[PDB]
Write a protein that binds this DNA or RNA. Structure first.
Ligand SMILES: [Mg+2]
Ligand SMILES: [Mg+2]
Ligand SMILES: [Zn+2]
Length: 712
RNA sequence: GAUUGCCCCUCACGAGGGGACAGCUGGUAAUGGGAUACC
DNA sequence: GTGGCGGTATCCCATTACCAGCTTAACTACGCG
DNA sequence: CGCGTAGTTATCGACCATTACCC
């Protein structure tokens, strides 16, 4: 880090009037050009307390290219530069200055021997050069901050510990980012991003002969300064029989009816009575669809690319920052002129300008004593809603809305409403877990179809009688009568088989064993636990031939790697976690009738909130796969922390030490009050839903005050 | 009442209803599932 | 800063978490029509 | 002379807090 001259003049005149980037860039030029005295007159008027420093992304689709990416001089030049910089040492990088001018660019390209495959744009190269130099220095800073963070952690532990006891670790070994020879161990990989820049920025398609479009875009005309018409008609009940987009009679009116072929009672909600509904357009053929696109081009040389900007139009008509009449050029001016083309997916990611859209993004969620002090400011003027969130698996989210107001030197926190998210979102959570299991079973059932006809028959036969074979084999080997022993009440930790075994009392050798102590933090004398029925069931299932198993599982791996479903589900769970924090926020906002909602979530370390899958106890279900039951705690924890930056929300991370335990009424925190989802204090006998009422009541009370919950 | 795409559901396959919209890379690390092996 | 899955060692696959990198543009200049 | 292509040259700043919490 090196001080700048510009920083001095601002710090000397504007201590606390930080400005956003666009004014900073323009302001720097004026100072350097028109002297130091002329920058104040530009920077005195316009400034903001919290300047928007975040731009949402918008994604569109590539239509056609001149040739495949990575066949372009910029893409080859970027790769050649990148893999040269990542294999430099620390000392060599210090004497590697690729300066920002055209003259120095060539001096660099010659002094090192790296080639540029016919591409030299000073700005475009400068973008690549800084980003590559940035990544190389980033992996070196990253260790240093982590090294600093451990040192800071050690620093606290010694001073605090050294007064209560003697033991204190003196120090620890420095973690380096370098090899013995100076090189970079685990150096960054190249990035395949076509970073578009100003001299190349997208602009509305006009027909040039080098650019040739697929046969569907036969005549593409679009006056870039005309207002783009609206696709759908205003009343979709005029569309006739033939034309596309025809809503049939039975589907307009709400009600229930039976289809003519089979007959099922299906509720039809009818046309949506909504005013911000996205409109879906339908063309007769794929040629009409193309002529109603928004094509803009990006030319860098003898190789171009055409992209379809309907994606940006939807993303702008959803945020309602685009008038109903708008031109193609106006749409492009709503976004920055530097897209990021994704070459391996043919997707271009625009972002909004700070003027068109853009919000402040708080870097961190406030914790500790910042919670009280933040409410001290925000309640000085208006009242702020306070939703307290407590995650679980019986009830995914439990929320309590309060209404903090301020009287002199206190924050009256009115409790308003405790609720949980509705059954529809619970139904989708259940349906998401069923879809995952269905996906897994289909992949398994299609890996069987990848076997040759001989091994296929073996697998089909064995799986059908797998449970029957194990049952009969176990009984015959140890003589146990199947009927005397209950089967359906078999779990992962029951010991029914052994007790029937021990009732015969053949020997004690075969059952008891000496569990090897698990490598871990905790070591004791090793327990002698008797082996369970799940272990017996596993060890007696009929194993499949090694060769067929190698072939069968290799087929599954191939199907699994190239399966579109896991992306489908991973987005599905994320959007279902986000949908469940929007209900929460919108419900509290329509109830508290306040603009500003600051949700309060527990400071749970998501690494240990993952959960597990589930098998129903039983003998039949030892040989089936585990139904997936992973927790949404990580999803919903991240979704609230994302409200912090995506929508500039305040977020409160507060330690949930005794929140689920400490009785609301009294300060007595014994661990035995909680029993699951039935709380009961053991001094002032009281019954509340541990999740809904005591956990949220206590979370809010540790929010209004920085102090952590009292202990004894 | 917003032209593509993406996610979920219904469908008389004409379509209808609802949902997400901060995303890319890269290096590491966990987590869950599946298979074998062994005390 | 993991719990009631009996422990460990190989792999295989998926998705996350965590922390690095990113996600302009006005003004000016010069070779062609 | 005007317009498509393109080089120069401008800014990058911070946080709390430690024996439970969900199965
Ligand atoms: Mg809790
Ligand atoms: Mg709870
Ligand atoms: Zn009590």
């Amino acid at each position: 880090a090196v001080e700048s001259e510009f920083s001095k003049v601002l710090k000397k005149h504007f201590p606390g009037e930080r400005f956003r980037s666009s004014y900073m860039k323009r302001g720097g030029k004026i100072l350097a050009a028109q002297g130091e005295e002329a920058v104040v007159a530009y920077l005195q008027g316009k400034s903001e307390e919290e300047p928007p420093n975040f731009q949402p992304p918008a994604k569109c689709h590539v239509v056609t290219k001149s040739r495949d990416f990575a066949e372009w001089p910029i893409m080859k030049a970027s790769e050649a530069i990148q893999r040269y910089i990542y294999a430099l040492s620390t000392t060599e990088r210090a004497a590697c200055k690729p300066g920002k001018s055209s003259e120095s660019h060539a001096a660099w390209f010659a002094a090192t021997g790296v080639s540029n495959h016919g591409y030299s744009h000073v700005q475009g190269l400068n973008l690549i050069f800084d980003h590559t130099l940035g990544r190389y220095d980033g992996v070196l800073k990253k260790v240093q901050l982590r090294n600093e963070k451990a040192r800071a952690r050690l620093e606290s532990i010694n001073a605090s510990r050294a007064d209560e006891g003697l033991p204190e670790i003196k120090a620890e070994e420095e973690e380096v980012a370098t090899n013995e020879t100076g090189h970079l161990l685990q150096p960054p990989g190249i990035n395949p991003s076509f970073y578009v820049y100003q001299t190349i920025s997208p602009q509305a398609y006009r027909p040039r002969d080098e650019i040739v479009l697929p046969p569907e875009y036969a005549g593409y005309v679009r006056d870039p300064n005309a207002p783009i018409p609206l696709g759908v008609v205003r009343n979709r009940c005029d569309i006739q029989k033939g034309c596309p987009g025809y809503i049939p009679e039975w589907q307009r009116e709400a009600g229930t009816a039976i289809s003519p072929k089979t007959g099922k009672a299906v509720t039809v909600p009818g046309l949506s009575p909504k005013k911000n509904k996205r409109m879906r357009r339908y063309w007769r053929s794929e040629k009409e669809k193309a002529q109603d696109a928004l094509l803009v081009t990006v030319r860098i040389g003898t190789d171009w690319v055409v992209i379809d900007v309907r994606g940006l139009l939807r993303n702008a008509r959803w945020r309602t920052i685009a008038p109903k009449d708008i031109s193609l050029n106006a749409l492009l001016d709503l976004f920055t002129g530097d897209p990021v083309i994704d070459v391996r997916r043919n997707i271009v990611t625009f972002t909004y300008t700070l003027d068109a859209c853009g919000t402040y993004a708080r870097k961190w969620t406030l914790k500790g004593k910042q919670t009280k002090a933040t409410l001290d400011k925000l309640t000085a003027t208006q009242t702020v809603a306070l939703v307290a969130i407590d995650l679980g698996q019986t009830n995914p989210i439990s929320a309590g809305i309060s209404r903090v107001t301020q009287e002199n030197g206190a924050l009256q926190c009115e409790p308003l409403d405790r609720f949980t998210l509705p059954d529809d979102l619970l139904k989708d959570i259940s349906a998401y877990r069923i879809a995952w299991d269905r996906n897994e079973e289909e992949l398994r059932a299609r890996s069987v179809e990848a076997l040759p006809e001989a091994q296929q028959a073996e697998v089909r036969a064995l799986d059908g009688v797998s449970k029957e074979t194990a049952r009969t084999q176990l009984c015959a080997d140890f003589g146990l009568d199947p009927k005397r022993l209950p089967w359906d009440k078999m779990s992962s930790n029951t010991t029914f088989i052994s007790e029937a075994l021990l009732s015969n009392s053949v020997s004690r050798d075969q059952v008891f064993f000496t569990p090897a102590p698990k490598k871990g933090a905790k070591k004791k004398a090793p327990v002698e636990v008797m082996r369970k029925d799940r272990t017996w069931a596993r060890a007696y299932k009929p194993r499949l031939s090694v060769e067929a198993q190698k072939l069968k599982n290799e087929a599954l791996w191939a199907l699994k790697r190239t399966s579109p479903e896991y992306l489908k589900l991973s987005r599905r769970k994320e959007e279902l976690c986000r949908r469940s924090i929007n209900y929460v926020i919108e419900k509290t906002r329509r109830r508290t009738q306040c603009q500003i909602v600051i949700p309060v979530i527990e400071d749970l370390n998501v690494r240990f909130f993952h959960g597990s899958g589930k098998r129903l106890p039983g003998w039949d279900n030892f040989f089936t796969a585990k139904k997936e039951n992973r927790w949404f705690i990580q999803g919903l924890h991240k979704a609230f922390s994302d409200l912090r930056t995506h929508r500039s929300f305040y977020v409160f991370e507060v330690r949930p030490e005794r929140t689920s335990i400490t009785c609301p009424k009294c300060g007595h925190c014994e661990v035995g009050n909680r029993d699951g989802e039935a709380f009961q204090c053991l001094s002032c006998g009281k019954t509340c839903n541990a999740d809904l009422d005591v956990a949220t009541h206590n979370l809010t009370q540790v929010a209004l005050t920085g102090k952590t919950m009292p202990k004894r």
